[PDB]
Structure formats: C-alpha cells, structure tokens
C-alpha cells in the first residue's frame, strides 16, 4: 500500500511534467546496489539481483512487471487530485 | 474557320512567347454550339521558360485568323488560367500515392544480389578500373585538391562536408559513378550496402581479395576489394575496427535521424552517422576510408554513400507523409543555389548529367533528374506509416540527449561518450561508457562549423545507472584521433545535455495513462473475493 | 508559516504611460464619437452632465439638472458617468479604458494629449486636429468651443517642509473612515482641478454647465474614480465596509439620472441596469 502511494506520486509527477522515473534529488545514492538484494548470497532471485540498484526500480511496471488496479486516490482521479492539492496550497497553512 | 494562336505576355519586360495554337471547326451553316467546359492546354513549359511565377502576371494575349489569313477581331475570352498541383504532393487533395517518375536504374540491397548480378557488377567496375576512369571520378572527392576560393588564397579539397548541402554533393557523386558503371555494361545500378543490420563478416562483394571468374574459369582479383591510388603510387587498405561488427546502435541512430522535421538537423545527424562507417572501416591506415583525403579511392565509398543516400531518400518520403517540404529546403537557403565545385567545373567533369544538375536544388528529385530509384523505401521492413508510427511512440517518452557543437578539426577522429556520477563524499568523477560518434576530415579540407548541436540519446544508459534528468551527473567525452596512439585535449565545448519531456507528457502528447509490460495486477484488499 | 498561494476588463492607464498605438486608437475613437451625432456621440453624452438639462424628466417645464454634486451620491453618479463615456469609445474603437492623470503626483505640465493642439499619427504620417485639446458646444453655435485657463497653483512643488495642496487634502480625504465625511472632503478636493484648468473662461471646466464638453473633464474624472477606488481599497484594508455605505443610505436607493431613463435617451443597457448608486 505504501508502495502504491509512491506509484501515485510518480503519476502525479507525470501530470506536473516533472521527474517521475528519475530523481534529481539524491544523486550519489541512486547507483549503489541494495546491500541485501545485491549480495550473491543469499538473494538468488535473478530479477531482484539484476535490478538491485535504486535507479533500476523507479518504474515498477516495466521492470517488476506489475500494476495497481487503480492509481486514483480516495476515489479521486489524478487531475482532480492535483486540483485538491492546489486548492489546499491556496490557503494560509502552518507547520511544525 | 477560326485558327486561334495564343501567347503569354508579362507586364515587366514585356516578354511575349507563344504557347501553341488550336483549331476550332466552323461553317456558315452550323448547329449552334458553345462549350459548357473550357478547353485546356498545358502551357507549363512556356511559363517556366519566362521565369514567370504563376502568381504574378503573366496575362495572356491571343490572335485569330481565318483560312485566308485575314485577322478576325474581338473574338474570345481566354481569361481563366488554372494551376494543377502534382498528385504526388499529398498536401491538400489525393491520399498518399507513391507517385510515378522516370525511374530508371533501380538500386537494390547488396544482400539480395545473385551471382550473376555480382559478377557483372565486378566486371563492369573492373572495366572502369584498369582503364583510367574511376580514379578520375574519385579525384573529385579525394586529396588532389581542385578548389581555390574565394580569391583564392589557398586550395581545398572539393567535397562538401560541414554544410547542409553535404548530401546533395555526395548524392551526385554516386550518381556519376553509377552512370559510368552502367555505361560499362553493368546489369544493375549501384547497390546499397545496408550496415544498419549487424554483420558477423563484411559483405561478400567487397570483403574477399579474390573472386572466382566463371567465364574465364580462373580466379581473379576482386575490383571492389581495393582501389588504386596511382598519383601517390599507393593502394587503399582497410583496418576494420571491432566496433563495426555486430553493434545495433546504428538502428537507434538512424531512427533519431529520421525524427528530424527540419532539414539541417536531419543533415547534421545524418552526416555524423555517415562519418561513423568511414571511421570503423578504414580506421588506422593513412590511405583508407577513414581519412577524408583518400576515402573516395576505396570503391566501398559509393557502396557506402548510395546507402547513406537511400537513408536521405527515405527521409524525403517520410517528409512527404508529414506534408513538410521533401524536395525543397526551408533550411539554409544561400547554399542551395551554389553549384557543386567539382561538378560545375567544365574540367575535369565531362559528364553532362552531373554538370547540368550540379546546383543543390537540382539534386533534390533524384528519381526525375538523376533517373534512379531504390527498390523499397521501407526501413527495417517498415512501411512509412509504420515508421512514423514508431517515431511518434519514440517521442512518447521522456528523453535525455547529449549535445555536441562540432566543427572542422584538421583531421578525422572518434569522440566517445562517458557518464560521470559524482560520489557523495568526496568529489569524484567520470568513468562509465555511454556512446561513440565520428568526425571526418583531412589536412586541406575546407573549414566548417555546424550552426546547431548534434544530439546523442543517452536515455537508456542513464536508465541502467538508475539516473534521471534531475539526478546529479555530468557528461564527458574522450577524443581519440585517427592515429591509434593519438588522444586529444579539449577541442570541442563540453557536451550539453538536453531533456525533452514526453508528448512523457512533457511537450506534445496529452496525458495518456501509458501502456507497459504490466503483468500481475495488484488490487485493494477490501475488493478481494 | 506558508502564506496563501467573458470579455476582459478595460484597463485605465496613466496618460503618460500610454503607448503610441494606444494614443492612436484613443485619438481616432474620440474623433469618431466626436463626429458621431448619435446618442453614443460626444455631444449627447456631454449633454447628460448639465447644460442641455434632462432632469427630473427631459419633458419638464422647468428642469433642475442633472448630475449629482454636493451630496453623498456624487461619486457614484460620476463613476457611472465615466463608464458611459468609456463604453462609447470602447465601441468607437479605443483599445484601452479612459486614461487618467493623477494629481497624486506633483505636476509641472498638463499631459501631452490634453494640451497639444495637433496630433500626428506615426503610422500614416498625416497631421490632424487633436480631439482631446478642446470640445465643441454644438447647440449654442457650430463655432463655439471650450476654452481653458491654467492657474499657477496647478504646478505647486513640495518646499522644504511644505507639500502641495493636493497631496495634503487628498490624504486628508483618505484619512476619513466614514463614507460621508470622505465624500464631503473628496468632492472639494475634486473641485480644485476644475477651478485650476477652468479659470475665468466661461465655456470651461470651472463652469458646471459646460465642463463635460471639454474632453479633459473625463480624463480628470477617471482619476477621480481611481481616488474613490483607492479609498475603497483602504477601507477593505481596515476591515471596514467598501462596496457599501452605512451613512446616507436613503440616497443610495434613488436611481442615477439620466441613466435611469432607459428609454430613447440612454441605453447602454449596463448603464441603465445599474442606475441605483
């Protein structure tokens, strides 16, 4: 479910015409293979082994071969989701 | 009886020129008759002859005489003049037609050849070879320079390479040689060797040094193996780089060449891509394909440049499909009228074909003017609709390119492309292979400077590093000249990197909820049964 | 703390801000509507204001007419009056709203398009009469024109401690938090340019009868409107009512004449519909 959330954001990023299968954020980390999955032992799953680098796993659909039933959130299409989010941004807000 | 002669006159000069006449049949006794339709004549040649645009006047004047020669007066209205677009243009009327042309000398794939066609090609070319001719043609491109300009202070090689009219020139080159090939009794026009398809060996025709002659029943030297350079008393040799064998990168590269809407963008990617083969094939020897000076003397030259030409041809056809200009260029205009310097020269070009059409604009319609055709203009077995389809799907995703501002170095070299990932702590850099492309040149080549960037798509290599357009990295080239030992300092500006958003949704195409591999659909736990 | 993140309205620029094209369209539009003998024309609209009287009804034996002055509803009336004018030259092909010249800034000169006798179109290069320079009072005589006299007080500059009359009294007007007090100050401040551009001349801005025949009037009053608008903004800043008046509310019911007529005299549908202050 947590993963699903990420997926939605990615699609959200697509709608915003910003990076979704790429990360301009954390550059030196995106190429280090996952320490347990990359280990020759005991990870013998070839799928995960070969794709253990973070950059490899960005687009779940093509590399890990799955989809979520719907990527709309709480019954909201991604456009109207962006609508809600923008309207939310439209008001004075306070954070800790 | 009413013989009627019609001429065209313009307001400007005023030029008068007869477009022909016609006869209407008449008698004093008669059935009353008038046409419900205008009688039309073709008038196109006289219009082109006056250098008279159809939009400017160009108003028409007629005189009418009876049988005795007496001039009858106040006769008729010829007011209307109509303009008919070619059926082949596709812009407004007729659907895609693949229009018919003069279309002699069909050019076909070297692979689809038969033993007969090959032996006949070998023999014809031989006749061209022991006699004087082919060298006389290769000298148009090669190192003995013929072109001093503009004063001229110094002399340069004649072939055009930095410019957008690069294809045109070489187009004509192949034409020329093919002409004289056919005149030597060749069964077929010059074939294209398609290197876009990977190969474990070289093509049969050019590879082996000796072929078996069936007619003479003896083994004889293959004329396509090597050309002689007798004015320096040498022979073309070949050192094939291992990078030539089996790489499928040329497919993607040609793909990005075809994407080009503009003619000059097309030209730059087209020509860098063309440089590649030169570099891989005649790599290390000084007298070979790789050095611009001696490249033409190796027969494979035209075998190469017909193929290159084919690519251009395909693009033109693609442009037809796109309703963009296919036989004209909105691109760099002042170059399109200057006649090709070796072809326009009264000496040593005695071929009237190449002489008359040495102007770039004359070489656009290859089928009508140079009288040749390619067997199929499909790329990788793909119809032009299919090709444009693929191209659009290619434009459907986010892509990342490396831009290269190129110019004439004194010499041919290979630039290789590497991806630099800075390490977190501390600063570190530059060590992962992305690509490779070539620049071609010789000592006395005419200087040149691209007015636009060459693009190399680095998207996939970045995807394999898990990198994005936003992720931290830089692009470094490593430059190795034609001399094997030679490596260079910083001749070209550091590679730019450009991100093109998908139509991707970045630019053109609307939000589409894209199609993927997408097995194993995951669903909400509550929606389970 | 993160702070908060269908024909387009006409924009009334400052006069000196106007581009050559805008000045062009304005000159030509006012030219046409000045030649226009229709109700949409300059003479008719200027008739609205005073001397050929239209109140209470144009049919009255004796006519006390017409524009509201010296009362709480003074601004509203003139606001409506301006949009009247405005719409006309919007229909006559002005690309921008009625220019204003603010006396909020100190003055050394009367604005260009106002004072220059002739105007030369940059695009056609033919010099014509400048429509804004003066106006003709047709019903008296074809020859009779509005004339002007500029009082020296117009060009006052801040001294060491001193500041211009207009600055002072304008801020004194904007100081007020009550609409009616605002109004009583505001109108008098508004009278000063009338007096200073008018002078002793009869057919001028100084005379109530003939004022609206001088095109300047309207540019002037554009800024007048702006002043009110400014005040409104001030009120909205103070958490006080703008868009409503708690004082003199009874006068806010009585509809603006002759905009209230509809009829043959005025329409302009939008102007009639909102004839209530």
> Closest chain A residue to B504 measured between Cα atoms?
A14
Shortest distance between the Cα of C236 and any Cα of chain A, in A, equals 19
> Any residues with CB less than 8 A from the CB of C216 and at least 6 apart, and which?
C114, C132, C148, C197, C205
Nearest to C147 by CA among C202, C209, C220: C202
| Nearest Cβ partner for B521 among A31, A58, A67 | A67
8-state DSSP, B109: B
**What is d(CA B154, CA C153) in angstroms, rounded to the nearest whole number?**
79
Q: For the CA atoms of B319, B325, B330, B331, what is the dihedral angle to 10 degrees?
A: 30
Shortest distance between the Cα of A92 and any Cα of chain B, in A, equals 30
With beta carbons under 8 A apart, name residues in chain B contacting A66: 518-522
A78-89 vs A2-15: helix axis angle to the nearest 10? 80
Residue length of chain B: 529
> Closest chain A residue to B464 measured between Cα atoms?
A56
Residue length of chain A: 96
- In Å, how far are A55, B168, B305, B316, B364 from B309, measured between CA atoms? 40, 9, 6, 11, 11
With beta carbons under 8 A apart, name residues in chain C contacting A91: 4
- List of E strands, B385-449: 399-404, 413-420, 432-439
Nearest to B513 by CA among C148, A10, C183, A1: A10
Residue B178 CA, distance from chain mean position: 16
Question: 3-state DSSP call for residue C218?
Answer: helix
Q: How many CB pairs under 8 A join A and C?
A: 15
- In Å, how far are C50, C78, C127, C191 from C75, measured between CA atoms? 16, 5, 37, 12
Backbone angles phi, psi at B445, to 5 degrees: -60, 145
**What is d(CA C56, CA C53) in angstroms, rounded to the nearest whole number?**
9
N-to-C CA span, chain C: 42
- List of E strands, A4-96: 67-68
Question: 3-state DSSP call for residue C4?
Answer: coil
> Closest chain A residue to C3 measured between Cα atoms?
A92
Residue B430 CA, distance from chain mean position: 36
**What is d(CA B90, CA C271) in angstroms, rounded to the nearest whole number?**
56
> Closest chain C residue to A94 measured between Cα atoms?
C1
Residue whose structure tokens are 């339709």 = B37
N-to-C CA span, chain A: 26
Burial class of residue B79, CB neighbours in 10 A (0-12, 13-18, 19+):
exposed
Helix (H) / strand (E) containing B354: helix B352-356
**What is d(CA B358, CA B352) in angstroms, rounded to the nearest whole number?**
10
**What is d(CA C98, CA C9) in angstroms, rounded to the nearest whole number?**
12
Kindly state whether C3 is in contact with chain A, defined as any CB-CB distance less than 8 angstroms.
yes
- In Å, how far are B60, C62, C134, C265, C274 from C53, measured between CA atoms? 69, 9, 22, 12, 21
Kindly state whether A61 is in contact with chain B, defined as any CB-CB distance less than 8 angstroms.
yes
- The residues pairing with B59 across neighbouring beta strands, listed in sequence order, are B9
Q: B–A contact (≥3 CB pairs within 8 Å)?
A: yes
**What is d(CA C181, CA A89) in angstroms, rounded to the nearest whole number?**
41
**What is d(CA C235, CA C112) in angstroms, rounded to the nearest whole number?**
34
**What is d(CA C276, CA C23) in angstroms, rounded to the nearest whole number?**
33
Q: C–A contact (≥3 CB pairs within 8 Å)?
A: yes
**What is d(CA C76, CA B413) in angstroms, rounded to the nearest whole number?**
80
Asked if residues C147 and C201 have their Cβ atoms less than 8 Å apart, the reply is yes
With beta carbons under 8 A apart, name residues in chain B contacting A58: 466, 468
> B516 vs A55: CB contact, 8 Å cut-off?
no
- List of E strands, A1-96: 67-68
C20-35 vs C42-49: helix axis angle to the nearest 10? 80
> Closest chain A residue to C2 measured between Cα atoms?
A93
Q: Is B381 left (phi over 0), alpha (psi -120 to 50) or beta?
A: left
Neighbours of chain B (3+ CB pairs under 8 A): A
> A89 vs C5: CB contact, 8 Å cut-off?
yes
CA atoms within 13 A on the CB side of B409: 20
β-bridge pairing B521-522 and A67-68 = parallel
Nearest to B170 by CA among B159, B179, B182, B162: B159
Output the six-digit token pair for B441.
């040149």
> Widest CA span of chain C, in angstroms?
68
Nearest to B312 by CA among B296, B355, B304: B304
Query: This structure's resolution (angstroms)?
Result: 5.1
> A67 vs B464: CB contact, 8 Å cut-off?
no
CB atoms within 10 A of CB B463: 19
Q: How many CB pairs under 8 A join A and B?
A: 96
CB atoms within 10 A of CB B474: 14
Asked if residues C145 and C46 have their Cβ atoms less than 8 Å apart, the reply is no
- The residues pairing with B479 across neighbouring beta strands, listed in sequence order, are B415
**What is d(CA C229, CA C236) in angstroms, rounded to the nearest whole number?**
10
Question: 3-state DSSP call for residue B343?
Answer: helix
| Nearest Cβ partner for A24 among B470, B519, B524 | B470
Q: Is B246 left (phi over 0), alpha (psi -120 to 50) or beta?
A: left
Asked if residues B228 and B134 have their Cβ atoms less than 8 Å apart, the reply is no
Question: 3-state DSSP call for residue B121?
Answer: helix
């Amino acid at each position: 479910t947590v993963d699903r959330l990420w997926a939605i954001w990615q699609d959200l990023q697509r709608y915003r015409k910003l990076d979704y299968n790429v990360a301009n954020c954390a550059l030196n980390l995106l190429n280090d293979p996952m320490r347990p999955f990359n280990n020759k032992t005991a990870n013998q799953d070839h799928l995960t082994f070969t794709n253990s680098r973070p950059n490899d796993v960005f687009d779940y659909q093509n590399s890990l071969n799955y989809k979520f039933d719907s990527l709309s959130f709480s019954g909201l299409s991604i456009p109207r989701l962006d609508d809600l989010l923008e309207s939310r941004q439209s008001h004075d807000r306070v954070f800790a | 009886s009413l013989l009627v002669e019609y001429f065209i006159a313009a307001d400007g000069t005023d030029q008068k020129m007869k477009a022909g006449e016609f006869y209407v049949l008449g008698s004093e006794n008669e059935m009353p008759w008038k046409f419900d339709r205008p009688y039309k004549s073709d008038i196109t040649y006289v219009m082109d002859a006056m250098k008279l645009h159809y939009t400017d006047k160009y108003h028409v004047e007629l005189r009418i005489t009876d049988m005795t020669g007496a001039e009858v007066t106040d006769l008729k209205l010829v007011t209307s003049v109509i303009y008919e677009p070619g059926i082949g243009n596709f812009g407004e009327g007729r659907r895609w037609i693949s229009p018919i042309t003069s279309a002699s000398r069909i050019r076909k794939n070297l692979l689809d050849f038969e033993d007969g066609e090959m032996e006949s090609l070998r023999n014809a070319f031989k006749q061209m070879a022991d006699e004087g001719r082919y060298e006389e043609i290769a000298s148009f491109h090669g190192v003995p320079a013929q072109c001093p300009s503009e004063d001229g202070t110094m002399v340069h090689t004649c072939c055009l390479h930095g410019m957008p009219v690069f294809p045109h020139w070489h187009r004509l080159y192949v034409s020329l040689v093919e002409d004289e090939l056919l005149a030597r009794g060749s069964g077929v026009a010059v074939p294209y060797w398609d290197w876009v398809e990977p190969f474990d060996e070289l093509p049969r025709l050019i590879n082996e040094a000796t072929f078996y002659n069936s007619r003479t029943l003896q083994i004889e030297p293959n004329p396509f193996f090597k050309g002689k350079i007798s004015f320096e008393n040498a022979e073309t040799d070949r050192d094939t780089q291992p990078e030539l064998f089996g790489n499928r990168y040329l497919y993607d590269h040609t793909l990005f060449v075809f994407e080009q809407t503009d003619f000059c963008e097309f030209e730059v990617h087209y020509e860098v891509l063309h440089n590649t083969i030169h570099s891989w094939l005649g790599g290390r020897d000084v007298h070979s394909m790789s050095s611009l000076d001696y490249a033409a003397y190796d027969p494979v030259f035209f075998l190469h440049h017909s193929n290159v030409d084919r690519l251009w041809a395909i693009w033109q056809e693609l442009q037809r499909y796109r309703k963009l200009s296919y036989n004209e260029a909105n691109c760099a205009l002042p170059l399109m009228n200057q006649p090709m310097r070796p072809f326009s020269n009264s000496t040593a070009n005695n071929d009237r074909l190449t002489f008359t059409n040495s102007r770039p604009n004359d070489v656009f319609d290859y089928q009508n003017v140079l009288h040749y055709k390619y067997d199929t203009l499909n790329f990788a077995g793909l119809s032009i609709p299919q090709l444009e389809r693929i191209l659009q799907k290619n434009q459907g995703r986010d892509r990342i390119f490396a831009g290269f501002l190129l110019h004439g170095i004194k010499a041919s070299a290979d630039v290789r492309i590497y991806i630099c990932v800075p390490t977190g702590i501390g600063e570190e850099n530059c060590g992962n292979y992305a690509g490779i492309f070539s620049v071609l040149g010789g000592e006395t080549e005419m200087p040149w400077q691209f007015d636009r960037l060459f693009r190399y798509e680095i998207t996939d290599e970045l995807k394999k590093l898990g990198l994005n357009q936003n992720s931290h990295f830089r692009v470094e080239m490593e430059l190795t000249a034609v001399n094997g030992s030679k490596i260079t300092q910083k001749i070209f500006p550091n590679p730019t990197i450009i991100f093109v958003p998908s139509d991707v949704e970045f630019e053109e195409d609307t939000w589409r909820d894209v199609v993927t591999s997408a097995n194993r659909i995951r669903r909400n736990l509550k929606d389970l049964s | 703390f993160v702070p908060k993140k269908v024909r387009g309205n006409l924009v009334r620029k400052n006069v000196d801000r106007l581009s050559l094209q805008e000045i062009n369209s304005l000159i030509h539009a006012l030219k046409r509507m000045q030649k226009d003998r229709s109700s949409d024309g300059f003479e008719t609209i200027a008739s609205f204001h005073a001397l050929p009287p239209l109140c209470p009804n144009p049919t009255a034996k004796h006519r006390h007419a017409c524009c509201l002055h010296g009362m709480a509803t003074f601004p509203q009336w003139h606001r409506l009056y301006v949009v009247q004018f405005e719409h006309s030259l919007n229909r006559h092909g002005a690309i921008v709203g009625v220019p204003y010249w603010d006396w909020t800034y100190p003055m050394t000169e009367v604005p260009g398009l106002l004072t220059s006798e002739k105007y030369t179109d940059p695009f056609t290069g033919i010099e014509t009469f400048n429509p804004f320079n003066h106006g003709h009072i047709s019903f008296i005589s074809p020859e009779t024109m509005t004339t002007r006299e500029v009082s020296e007080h117009l060009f006052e500059q801040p001294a060491l401690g001193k500041q211009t009359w207009l600055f002072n009294n304008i801020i004194l007007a904007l100081e007020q938090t009550d609409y009616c007090d605002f109004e009583v100050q505001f109108e008098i401040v508004h009278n000063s340019i009338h007096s200073w551009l008018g002078g002793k001349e009869l057919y001028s801005l100084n005379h109530l009868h003939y004022a609206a025949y001088d095109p300047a009037f309207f540019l002037h009053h554009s800024n007048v409107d702006r002043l009110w608008v400014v005040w409104q903004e001030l009120q909205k800043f103070r958490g006080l009512p703008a868009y409503e008046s708690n004082c003199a509310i009874e006068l806010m019911s009585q509809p603006l004449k002759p905009f209230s007529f509809g009829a043959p005299y005025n329409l302009n549908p939008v102007t009639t519909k909102y004839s209530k202050p």
